Amino acid sequence: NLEDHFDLAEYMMKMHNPMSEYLYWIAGFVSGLHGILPLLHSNYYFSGMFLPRDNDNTQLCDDSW
Amino acid sequence: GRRLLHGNYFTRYLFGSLAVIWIAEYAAACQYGIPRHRNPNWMWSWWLEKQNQIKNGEIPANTPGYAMVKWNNEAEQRWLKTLNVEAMNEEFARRREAYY
Amino acid sequence: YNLVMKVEFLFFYLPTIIVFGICIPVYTINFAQEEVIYTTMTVKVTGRQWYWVYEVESPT
Amino acid sequence: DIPWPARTDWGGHDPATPFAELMINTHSMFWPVAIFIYVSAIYMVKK
Amino acid sequence: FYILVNNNKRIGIYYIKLSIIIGILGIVLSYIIRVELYNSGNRIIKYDNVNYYNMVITLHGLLMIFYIIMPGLYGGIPLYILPILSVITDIVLPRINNISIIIVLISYIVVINSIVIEYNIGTGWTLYPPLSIIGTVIVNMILYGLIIIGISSIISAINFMNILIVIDGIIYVYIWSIIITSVLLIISLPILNGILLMILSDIYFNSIYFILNGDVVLYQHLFWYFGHPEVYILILPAFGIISIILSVLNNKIIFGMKSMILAIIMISILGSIVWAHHIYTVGLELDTKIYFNNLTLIISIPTGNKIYNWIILYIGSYNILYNGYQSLIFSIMFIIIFIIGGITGIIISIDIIDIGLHDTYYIVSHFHYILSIGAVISLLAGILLLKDIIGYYNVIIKINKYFGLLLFININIIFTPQFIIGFNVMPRRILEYSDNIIVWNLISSIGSISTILILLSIF
Amino acid sequence: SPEDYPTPQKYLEGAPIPSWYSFQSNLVGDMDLKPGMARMLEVDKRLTVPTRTHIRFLITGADVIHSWSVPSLGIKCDATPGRLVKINTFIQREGVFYGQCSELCGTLHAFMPIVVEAVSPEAFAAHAKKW
Amino acid sequence: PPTRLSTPLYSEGGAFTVNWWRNRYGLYSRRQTDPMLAEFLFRQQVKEWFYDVPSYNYAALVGLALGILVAVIWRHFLFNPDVYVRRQELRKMWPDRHRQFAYAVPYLNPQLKNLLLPYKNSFIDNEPDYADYNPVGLRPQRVMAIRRIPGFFWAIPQYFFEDPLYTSCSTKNMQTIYKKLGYSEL
Amino acid sequence: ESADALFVGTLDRLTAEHPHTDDPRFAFQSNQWNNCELRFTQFCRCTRELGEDDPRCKYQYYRAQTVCHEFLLEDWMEHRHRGTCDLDIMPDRQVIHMRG
Amino acid sequence: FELNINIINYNYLGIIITVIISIYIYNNSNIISVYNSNLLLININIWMKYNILDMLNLNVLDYKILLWIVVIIISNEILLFVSFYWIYYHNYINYYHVNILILNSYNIVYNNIILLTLLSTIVNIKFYNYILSYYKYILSYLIYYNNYMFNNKIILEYKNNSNYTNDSVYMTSYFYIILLHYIHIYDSIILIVVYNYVNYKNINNYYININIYYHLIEVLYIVISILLYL
């Protein structure tokens, strides 16, 4: 059939449902979260803070904020 | 019927390689002058002298090495408490009489 | 063709000459690292998690 | 001895042993050759 | 269907799609590093959580090599065009091709799941024992991923080798690059599997290979015996793509085709016997060091011939043809970038120079110029060349001079300072550093944040 | 035989045999830093060595692989368990040379710096005797 | 390279020749299905690969690299003291391995080390002969070279007698300076 | 009182008079692990013949310390004291030649 | 006319096999692993079924493709053993002077060499019959007897050995190299249990594969015997 000639015919003929693209981008977004979420979780687990304040592990001036 | 390898390839490259390895090693020894006499023994001079004494009969037979040293570790001290060379020799003598 | 063959030859051996120029320096510097020296003092260094331990000979 | 701010220190800096000097000289010896290799090739990247 | 498809061209697309998805996690991990290295003192990682940073660098290295670049260059483009470059219709082993991509995905899921569930610790992408064998279960999980990835790589290598049987045309230079890469995998992978099993034995079977009286340096030999062929396995497919792009876009027959083919073959032979230049600082014998140093320099001779043959392909091409296409720019950029990376490789090949530059950011910059710029740009260039054949759209990359210029400027900002930092000196795999290295580290960090912003412009 | 174990004649006559002294070098913590110390590089106990003397460094690692790096002295030797690597050096000028571990070794790979101070031989002799 | 199948190709006798190559080239080939086609494809491959002038350059390189590779492997087994293949010495404690120790000193003094060590002064600027003297005698006493290493060492003069400061930086002069102060023995 | 006296007698003497220099048997290699094991074995054998109190064996221990790190020696000396140090096992109680 | 190749469009074993692999990682009980291994065996058999069904395509290159695949697999098996030999010989300098009892060179080596040689002779006779389009029923049962003795001998040797994996790197390498050979012997049992007479004879890739594989196992043991026992 003519519809079956091209692989991924709907996408190549520009008729595909946009949800397919959204899932691909969402999948990539979820992959990225695997680096950020465990960072926050691990920081809180060992320190009790999600993120440090810059240079908070060093001596700071009295007025430092 | 067409041949890809040497007609006697398996034997040729096994024995041939072994021969070349052996001949190369002899050449290497000659160049460096390495002694080629084989000794199967430990070279501790003091120990070899003690073994000769046992062979000569100066030291009683079946006497342990730790019975002859000037420093003993803890395990050897444990063994020295139960060591009786004289009894061991008598037991061996009894076995020989029974056998003959 | 005659000119092109020379260019191909240079593409191969100009890098080769450069390599040869480096080879001799490489041998020399390697020998310098492993030269037998008449050292008079020994310092023993042990790496541990996470600090360094140093052992030195105390003077008599 | 110690790093200093905004220093190129191309090839090393502040040797204190004869071997340390050797390391720096070796890099400086080859550095001009590296430039020659780069410049000669890059000059011909064109139509 | 979507998962049951055996069409090689579909599977090639899946490899490219999966590499991009995994690329995001790799980019995230890379972004975490440069943010932390912006200045001395903790910025986004607690001092009490330094273990996480070690995991970030370990995964960044592993994911980018085995899960992103290798599938992209050895699985994605080859599965799409290789059966087309050959006169054959489809891949020889269709069912094996399907399982290979599925295997890659499952191993990725295992790795990322281990981040979420296991305690986060790191030992570097090289997994040197004894550190690797005294760690927690996350190290066990990472080993399973590598072994599983190894299965996909070897079966894919078997698939490409079978093209020699069925090829009905001429073996083009690109086909040679894939074939020789397959040969390297076949000879190097089994050695990797053997040593990885020994790591598991110590971790999980009470083996004692990596404790006193057992030489830990034994691991380094077996690992790097596969390690260096791996870097040559990554780049050789990139060389094939550059040869096609330059010839096609300039309407010039590839010059010295046989010289190009022999150069690829020579590199593989040399690349299999030079692994110990990764072990200069361990204290090898004098003669051993001289041998590896001498043979390592020889690898430049065949690699140089390819560079010059590429240059003459671009020289003399017609002026009327527009030269601003992104694929052409990337191909030309590769020659400029690869020369930088290779020359620095020759500098660190000299073992006495390497004594100062081992485990420093100079080595980082060395392999980033080759891989992060060169290999990525080659993969981008190949995908762009095949845009009409592949048929993807909804991006502005084909004619985008801003993207090419900004990418080139900013990636150079990231990694040029790292050469300078190497002499300063800053060790690798380090979170904190002395205050006097901040300036150069700050400049590279500004480069990293800038590059990520540029990627958003393509959409 | 006694002659199988060579010994200098001086010791056979009653000269005291030298002993060895061991100490531990640790990073100075951020909260313990003083106004002039270099963060990430200072240690609580430095290694003092004489200048203009041939010295033999024997470097090994007890647990995991570390690497003993002193860039100014041109030394970067892996401290591998099971290998007692030998490094020779000859320091030409006095100074304090800082270094860092150059092999990933665990959580605190970045927090085990190397500090070597080279002093005059007369200064070293007095220092060695006191400590 | 002939273009007509009627003209024969000259072949020598031996294990790597045109005839030897023809016999084995088509063993695994599905394309050489008849004499005419087989010869055409055989000459096509021979013309493309063996008549390509630049290809011979790579043949030289593989030979050189393999020759070095085989020699270094063989040398380690034959001469390296630390490499054991026989078991006589491994069945004894270290002090008793007299035969193995015979390799040590000769293996420590290869010819090339003696030739190239004197050229350290092409790299070191101050006291290039600091380690030349060693009274123990395991190695020869070193004497600094009189010429720079050939190649890329244009930084230093061609011969060291052209350098006005070379003698002042020698280990002997520095030892004189520091001895005069009582600073150090060396 | 001879120039080559160090080499004469034993190769051991070379580092007995120059403790901090390379040993002829292990100078070719940077790794000195085998050098430490030989030195320790020599110390073990000295005590067996002469006893710990002898100044010769005291110096042999010092020679071992010159090339052996203290964490190694403490562990090895513990094994020697118990009697499980494979280096110090008496020859007549070795098992190296048994079962092959 | 017809297409040169009959394309295979869809396949679902790949998903199942990959999921079966994942189950090994995600197990909470070693009992699941045992049953999971049976699933892997079942699905691999289905894949072998597809290869036999592909004969209907009458493609001349199918035999050649599978034969060269086996050659690659054989090389990988050899290189895997090389790594174990590499591991064994790296610590060679630490062997033969430690207080452990190494294996005797008289009993185990001789009977195993004799036993494995008989295995080769049986397989050789199978090849000869396959050449002659002939079958002998007893041959398969000789292999089973041969494999039974090999299993019985190796089990006793491990149980009666007085040294353990944790005693020295020598012992670890001895046990591991011997186990690796055993696993390859067990893989041979997996292959040989289905040996039958098929009437399409010399176009059956199984016969050439079995002959090559059995020869490889036996030659590998010769290398092992020289390294460890002799």
Ligand SMILES: CCCCCCCCCCCCCCCCCC(=O)OC[C@H](COP(=O)([O-])OCC(O)COP(=O)([O-])OC[C@@H](COC(=O)CCCCCCCCCCCCCCCCC)OC(=O)CCCCCCCCCCCCCCCCC)OC(=O)CCCCCCCCCCCCCCCCC
């Ligand atoms: C490196 C980056 C930069 C790169 C730059 C360079 C790029 C150069 C270009 C490269 C191009 C390569 C070649 C491209 C060829 C494309 C061919 C193609 O399009 O094929 C057609 C193919 C399919 O088209 P089709 O033929 O119409 O298919 C029809 C379907 O088969 C059938 O239709 P259907 O509707 O029946 O579909 C079924 C549908 C059914 O659909 C639905 O029912 C949808 C329902 C809605 C769901 C939406 C998601 C909801 C999420 C909620 C999240 C909540 C979070 C709450 C948080 C709370 C916190 C407090 O789905 C399913 O049933 C299964 C879905 C499974 C997959 C999706 C998984 C998502 C992630 C899951 C994560 C789970 C995490 C768990 C972790 C737990 C750990 C313990 O297209 C796609 O699949 C989309 C591709 C899109 C990209 C195309 C290329 C464009 C160029 C590149 C753009 C840039 C991309 C950058 C990467 C992404 C960044 C993020």
Ligand SMILES: CCCCCCCCCCCCCCCCCC(=O)OC[C@H](COP(=O)([O-])OCC(O)COP(=O)([O-])OC[C@@H](COC(=O)CCCCCCCCCCCCCCCCC)OC(=O)CCCCCCCCCCCCCCCCC)OC(=O)CCCCCCCCCCCCCCCCC
């Ligand atoms: C002796 C003892 C005996 C004991 C007995 C015990 C027995 C035990 C049994 C054990 C075995 C159980 C399993 C059996 C499998 C059977 C297979 C079979 O025959 O299937 C026929 C069956 C035919 O289906 P059907 O009934 O005709 O209906 C199909 C539809 O009508 C339409 O047909 P279709 O095929 O087009 O539709 C399928 C497809 C259609 O939908 C689509 O494709 C959606 C459109 C595409 C959107 C873009 C996706 C992203 C781009 C991916 C590019 C690479 C793709 C590579 C190829 C696909 C790989 C899956 O949707 C899906 O199935 C999901 C697609 C997922 C794509 C994943 C791509 C990468 C995701 C990256 C995630 C990043 C975030 C990280 C965190 C999360 C990690 C998990 O196969 C399927 O189509 C379904 C397969 C479903 C099973 C998949 C299992 C996956 C497991 C993964 C590991 C999870 C473990 C860890 C969990 C962690 C969670 C966080």
Ligand SMILES: CCCCCCCCCCCCCCCCCC(=O)OC[C@H](COP(=O)([O-])OCC(O)COP(=O)([O-])OC[C@@H](COC(=O)CCCCCCCCCCCCCCCCC)OC(=O)CCCCCCCCCCCCCCCCC)OC(=O)CCCCCCCCCCCCCCCCC
């Ligand atoms: C004292 C000891 C003495 C011992 C003496 C021993 C004597 C032995 C005699 C051996 C004679 C061989 C005769 C057969 C020749 C080949 C014919 C052939 O293959 O027919 C095609 C035949 C297909 O039949 P067809 O239909 O005629 O093919 C049409 C073409 O496809 C359509 O293509 P086309 O028409 O466009 O072009 C034709 C030709 C175009 O290609 C050629 O004509 C190539 C011609 C040169 C080949 C090399 C000859 C040897 C050169 C001298 C080397 C000396 C080194 C000395 C070192 C000494 C150190 C001590 O195509 C092919 O040849 C395709 C196959 C190429 C496979 C290459 C695989 C990688 C190997 C490395 C490449 C060679 C590098 C040599 C050195 C380079 C540096 C100087 O191929 C197959 O059947 C494919 C099977 C694939 C199996 C793969 C899996 C095997 C297991 C792999 C294990 C790991 C391997 C590791 C390799 C490492 C490499 C670095």
Ligand SMILES: CCCCCCCCCCCCCCCCCC(=O)OC[C@H](COP(=O)([O-])OCC(O)COP(=O)([O-])OC[C@@H](COC(=O)CCCCCCCCCCCCCCCCC)OC(=O)CCCCCCCCCCCCCCCCC)OC(=O)CCCCCCCCCCCCCCCCC
């Ligand atoms: C007055 C009687 C004197 C008898 C003296 C003893 C003789 C016993 C001979 C046993 C030979 C067994 C050889 C086993 C290898 C496989 C043979 C084979 O291929 O068979 C194919 C044959 C037919 O296969 P096919 O596929 O139909 O045809 C294939 C060909 O086309 C056509 O195949 P084919 O016809 O060319 O086959 C040629 C031949 C190829 O093999 C040979 O020619 C090998 C000959 C080796 C000789 C081994 C002698 C061992 C004697 C040791 C005694 C030690 C005493 C120590 C005393 C210590 C004192 C302190 O195979 C046979 O003939 C195998 C034996 C057939 C007997 C089957 C019926 C059940 C067993 C009956 C045993 C009766 C024993 C009576 C004893 C009476 C004594 C007064 O297979 C069968 O018949 C089915 C399986 C059963 C066969 C094996 C039976 C084992 C019986 C062992 C008896 C001796 C036990 C001694 C114990 C001592 C303990 C201390």
Ligand code: HEA
């Ligand atoms: C695709 C990836 C890739 C590629 C192609 C290369 C290619 C090369 N690499 Fe690289 N390398 C890596 C990836 C790569 N490398 C990685 C990832 C590491 C670190 C691993 C880790 O530690 O984690 C590394 C590490 C690394 C080290 C240090 C290892 C260590 O101690 O940690 C060295 C040392 O020599 C090295 C050398 C080389 C050389 C000599 C080449 C050659 O192939 C380059 C040859 C190219 C040229 C020279 C330029 C082109 C030629 C010319 C312009 C003309 C001729 C030039 C001359 C004659 C000089 N590499």
Ligand code: HEA
């Ligand atoms: C392919 C491999 C790859 C790639 C792309 C990168 C990319 C980058 N890497 Fe690197 N990196 C490694 C492999 C890679 N890296 C390895 C192997 C190590 C050693 C690990 C170890 O220490 O053990 C390392 C180490 C490493 C470190 C040292 C960590 C430490 O020692 O503490 C740092 C620090 O900044 C860094 C930064 C970066 C940055 C900023 C980018 C990038 O941001 C550069 C610019 C790139 C982009 C902006 C993204 C472009 C898009 C893609 C790359 C995906 C494209 C996908 C397709 C085309 C399908 N990397």
Ligand SMILES: CCCCCCCC/C=C\CCCCCCCC(=O)OC[C@H](COP(=O)(O)OCCN)OC(=O)CCCCCCC/C=C/CCCCCCCC
């Ligand atoms: C790995 C150990 C395996 C032990 C196997 C035992 C069986 C022996 C027979 C098969 C193996 C072949 C070796 C036979 C050696 C016979 C002579 C012998 O004993 O030689 C010993 C001698 C050294 O022993 P020692 O005296 O203890 O050491 C002195 C200082 N190094 O051994 C050797 O030198 C030979 C060992 C290597 C032989 C193999 C060939 C070496 C060169 C390989 C080159 C590889 C690169 C490619 C080559 C291409 C060729 C076309």
Ligand SMILES: CCCCCCCC/C=C\CCCCCCCC(=O)O[C@H](COC(=O)CCCCCCC/C=C/CCCCCCCC)COP(=O)(O)OCCN
């Ligand atoms: C039926 C098919 C059988 C095929 C079997 C193949 C076996 C080999 C497979 C590959 C593995 C090679 C063995 C591993 C060798 C490691 C040696 C090593 O690491 O030794 C170095 C020293 O090694 C060297 O000098 C390096 C030599 C390089 C060896 C390379 C061997 C393998 C090369 C394979 C390349 C691919 C094939 C090329 C074929 C020909 C191409 C024209 C360590 O030295 P030191 O630590 O200083 O110790 C010295 C004494 N204490």
Ligand code: CUA
């Ligand atoms: Cu120790 Cu890093």
Ligand SMILES: [O-][O-]
């Ligand atoms: O690895 O270069």
Ligand SMILES: [Cu+2]
């Ligand atoms: Cu490398």
Ligand SMILES: [K+]
């Ligand atoms: K920081």
Ligand SMILES: [Mg+2]
């Ligand atoms: Mg390192």
